[PDB]
C-alpha cells in the first residue's frame, strides 16, 4: 500500500543554463555572393519552419541585463570582425610624414579645411625605388607633426586595410539552442526587462537579428509592439543606460553627396592600397534628414511613457551631449561601407511641460578603432560614387543627469555607446534553459518479482 | 526617489561604550567615516556587510528603510565624523566626542 518512488523519463524540467548558441542565417542566402563579414563563408541555414508554441498555463522569470547570450554576441561579433580582418595588408608604410595643403574644388565654405591633399615618397614594388603620390584625406585622420602631418593613429597600434570585397551590410542572424536545451520567450508585449512574464512560448530558434552598429540611437531594431518602451536595470542608478524603444519606425535619409573616386597603388608585391581619387564637382558636407513632425510627436510619446516613472507634471528636458570620445559625442553608424558621425544635438533641443524636415550635418573619418578596443586600427577603403542611405530609427540609448532636487526637472542626454546595449534591445525577450527529462514520483506499483 | 534623513547629531559617549548611530533612507545604504584633513573611509556597504579591514566591533542593521550602525567597545582612535550614503545624496556628517 505504501507508495514507492519510481522512474520517469522525457519529463519536462527547466534549469537556467548557458551553452554556446548555434549559428544560423536564413537559408544561407549570403552564399550567393562573397562574402558577408559575419556570415563568413558558411553558417547553418535556418529551419524552413522555426515553430514556436505558446505554453499552456505557464509564466516564467526573465532577467534582462543578466542574460549572457548578449555577452556571447559581444565576443562572437568581435571575433568575426577579426576573423575577416586578419587576412589583410598592413598599412604601416603610411606612417611616413606627409606634406599637405588645403585643396578645394568649388568647396562650400562650411567645408573649408575638412579635406587635405597630401603626399609622400611611398615605397615601390622594388626596394630600391621610391615615387611621389598624393591623395585626399579627411582632416580627422591626420594630425600636424609639430604643414606636415602624420596619420592620427601612428602613435597607437598599427592601421590595416585590405579585402574591401567583404560586405559590411548586416544580415540577420538566428540562434538555436543545443539539443537538450531550449529557448524561452516572453509573449507579453509590454514586458518589463526583468521579472516573471504572464505569457510565454518556446521556440526552436530566435528571430533573426542584424549586427547593427550605432552609438546614440538604435537603428533597424524590432518595433515595440504597442507602445514606446523605456527600460533600465535600475532607474535610480543613473550610471545605467536608459533603453528607449519606439513602437513605430522613424525614417531617416542619409547621404554623402560628393561623387567619390578611387585610386590604388602597390606598396610592394601583393600589397595593393586603396586611396581616395580626386573628387569631381562641388564639395559638400555629408548630411541626413528626419521629419520635424515625426520627431516631435514621437518624442512626446517617449515623454508620455517617461512620466510613468516620475511624479505628475514633472519638468522634462533633453540636451546636447556632455562630450567625450567622438564615438559617443556624436551619433555614429556605418552605411554603404563607410563610417559616419553626426551632430544630433539639434534633435534634443526641447523641454517638456505638463498639459517639413530636420537636417543634420555629418562627418567622415576613415581611421577606425572598433568598440572600445585600442589594440587595432583600420582604414576604411574609399567608397566610389554618391552614398545614399535609408533606414528606420527604432530607439534611443539615453542617460539621465545626476543630482538635482525635489524629484523634479529631470534632464537627459544621448550616451551608452557600448555595443552590448544595442544587442540587449533585441535579446531581452529570451532566456535559455536546460532540459532534464529524468524525474521521479511515488507510485502504487512495484517491480514484478522474478 | 531619495528619502534620506539622519538623527545622530554628535555623541559624547565614554570610552568602551558600545555606541550606535541611525539614519533612514529609500534604497541601498553605504556607511562612511571621516577625520579632518583626511579622505573618508567606507565602513559598511550595500545595507549590510562590513568593508574589508573594518574591525569586528563594527556592525549594523536594516529593516524597511531603517538603518543602524554600531561600534562595540568604542575607543578614542575611533572618533570620526560618520555618514549614510546613496548614490549621490549624502547625509551631513555626524560625529563622536568624549
Amino acid at each position, epitope marked *: 500500500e505504501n507508495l514507492w518512488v519510481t522512474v520517469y523519463y522525457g519529463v519536462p524540467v527547466w534549469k537556467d543554463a548557458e551553452t554556446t548558441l548555434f549559428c544560423a542565417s536564413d537559408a544561407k542566402a549570403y552564399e550567393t555572393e562573397k562574402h558577408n563579414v559575419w556570415a563568413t563563408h558558411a553558417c547553418v541555414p535556418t529551419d524552413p519552419n522555426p515553430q514556436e508554441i505558446h505554453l499552456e498555463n505557464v509564466t516564467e522569470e526573465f532577467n534582462m541585463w543578466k542574460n549572457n547570450m548578449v555577452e556571447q554576441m559581444h565576443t562572437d561579433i568581435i571575433s568575426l570582425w577579426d576573423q575577416s580582418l586578419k587576412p589583410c595588408v598592413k598599412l604601416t608604410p603610411l606612417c611616413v610624414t606627409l606634406q599637405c595643403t588645403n585643396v578645394t574644388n568649388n568647396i562650400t565654405d562650411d567645408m573649408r579645411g575638412e579635406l587635405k591633399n597630401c603626399s609622400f615618397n611611398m615605397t615601390t614594388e622594388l626596394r630600391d625605388k621610391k615615387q611621389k603620390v598624393y591623395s585626399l584625406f579627411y582632416r580627422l585622420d591626420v594630425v600636424q607633426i609639430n604643414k606636415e602631418y602624420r596619420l592620427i593613429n601612428c602613435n597607437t597600434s598599427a592601421i590595416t586595410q585590405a579585402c574591401p570585397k567583404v560586405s559590411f551590410e548586416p544580415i540577420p542572424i538566428h540562434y538555436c539552442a543545443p539539443a537538450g536545451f531550449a529557448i524561452l520567450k516572453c509573449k507579453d508585449k509590454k514586458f518589463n526587462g526583468t521579472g516573471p512574464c504572464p505569457s510565454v512560448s518556446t521556440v526552436q530558434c530566435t528571430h533573426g537579428i542584424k549586427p547593427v552598429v550605432s552609438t546614440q540611437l538604435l537603428l533597424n531594431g524590432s518595433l515595440a509592439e504597442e507602445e514606446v518602451m523605456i527600460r533600465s536595470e535600475n532607474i535610480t542608478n*543613473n*550610471a545605467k543606460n536608459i533603453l528607449v524603444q519606439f513602437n513605430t519606425p522613424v525614417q531617416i535619409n542619409c547621404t554623402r553627396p560628393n561623387n567619390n573616386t578611387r585610386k590604388s597603388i602597390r606598396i610592394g608585391p601583393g600589397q595593393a592600397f586603396y586611396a581616395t581619387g580626386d573628387i569631381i564637382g562641388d564639395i559638400r558636407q555629408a548630411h541626413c534628414n528626419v521629419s520635424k513632425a515625426t520627431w516631435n510627436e514621437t518624442l512626446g510619446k517617449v515623454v508620455k511613457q517617461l512620466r510613468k516613472h516620475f511624479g505628475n507634471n514633472t519638468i522634462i528636458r533633453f540636451a546636447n551631449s556632455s562630450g567625450g570620445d567622438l564615438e559617443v559625442t556624436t551619433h555614429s553608424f556605418n552605411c554603404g561601407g563607410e563610417f559616419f558621425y553626426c551632430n544630433t544635438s539639434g534633435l534634443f533641443n526641447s523641454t517638456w511641460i505638463s498639459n517639413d524636415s530636420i537636417t543634420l550635418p555629418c562627418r567622415i573619418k576613415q581611421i577606425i578603432n572598433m568598440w*572600445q578596443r585600442i589594440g587595432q586600427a583600420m582604414y576604411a577603403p574609399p567608397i566610389q560614387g554618391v552614398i545614399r542611405c535609408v533606414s528606420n530609427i527604432t530607439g534611443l540609448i539615453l542617460t539621465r543627469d*545626476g543630482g538635482s532636487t525635489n524629484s523634479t526637472t529631470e534632464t537627459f542626454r544621448p550616451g551608452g555607446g*557600448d555595443m552590448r546595449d544595442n544587442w540587449r534591445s533585441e535579446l531581452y525577450k529570451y532566456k535559455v534553459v536546460k532540459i532534464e527529462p529524468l524525474g521521479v514520483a511515488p507510485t502504487r506499483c512495484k517491480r514484478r518479482v522474478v | 526617489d531619495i528619502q534620506m534623513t539622519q538623527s545622530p547629531s554628535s555623541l559624547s559617549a565614554s570610552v568602551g561604550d558600545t555606541v550606535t548611530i541611525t539614519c533612514q533612507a529609500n534604497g541601498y545604504l*553605504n556607511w562612511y567615516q571621516q577625520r579632518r584633513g583626511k*579622505a573618508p573611509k*567606507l565602513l559598511i556597504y550595500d545595507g549590510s556587510k562590513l568593508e574589508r579591514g573594518v574591525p569586528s566591533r563594527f556592525s549594523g542593521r536594516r529593516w524597511g528603510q531603517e538603518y543602524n550602525l554600531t561600534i562595540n567597545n568604542l575607543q578614542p582612535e575611533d572618533i570620526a565624523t560618520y555618514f549614510c550614503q546613496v548614490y549621490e545624496f*549624502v547625509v551631513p556628517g555626524t560625529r563622536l566626542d568624549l
Partner: nanobody
Framework: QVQLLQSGAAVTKPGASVRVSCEAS????????IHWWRQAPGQGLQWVGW????????????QFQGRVSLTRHASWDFDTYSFYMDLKALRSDDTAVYFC????????????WGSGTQVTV
C-alpha cells in the same frame, strides 16, 4: 599600488579657470567609474560628477552645467590614466577640497579616494 595619485593645492583670483587632476593605479581603470566630490569647509560632502573612462563620458548635476567638464587621458601603453576636472568660473564659494573616487560596485561602493586637494579662490 591600488591608491590614486592626487594633484597639489592651488589658489586663483575669482573668475579664473582652474584644473585639478588624479592618476591611475594598479586596479584596471577601464572597469570602474571615476567620481569627483567636493566639500566646502564646515559642510557635508557634495557630489560633483562621474566619468566613464572607457568612453570619456561625464555626468554632472544641473547646478554645474556649463561650468565644469571632466576629461581623461592615458599612456600610449595604457598603463596609466589621468583625470581632470575643469572649472571655468571660480567664485568664492567654489573653495573646497576636491577629490577623485572609484565606483567599485553598482551600489556605488567607494573604497578608494585620492587624498584630495584644496582649491581656493
Amino acid at each position: 599600488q591600488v591608491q590614486l595619485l592626487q594633484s597639489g593645492a592651488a589658489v586663483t583670483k575669482p573668475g579664473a579657470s582652474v584644473r585639478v587632476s588624479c592618476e591611475a593605479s594598479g586596479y584596471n581603470i577601464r572597469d570602474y567609474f571615476i567620481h569627483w566630490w567636493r566639500q566646502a569647509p564646515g559642510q557635508g560632502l557634495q557630489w560633483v560628477g562621474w566619468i566613464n573612462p572607457k568612453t570619456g563620458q561625464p555626468n554632472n548635476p544641473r547646478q554645474f552645467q556649463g561650468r565644469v567638464s571632466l576629461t581623461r587621458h592615458a599612456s600610449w601603453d595604457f598603463d596609466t590614466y589621468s583625470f581632470y576636472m575643469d572649472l571655468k568660473a571660480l567664485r568664492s564659494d567654489d573653495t573646497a577640497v576636491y577629490f577623485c573616487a572609484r565606483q567599485r560596485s553598482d551600489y556605488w561602493d567607494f573604497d578608494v579616494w585620492g587624498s584630495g586637494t584644496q582649491v581656493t579662490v
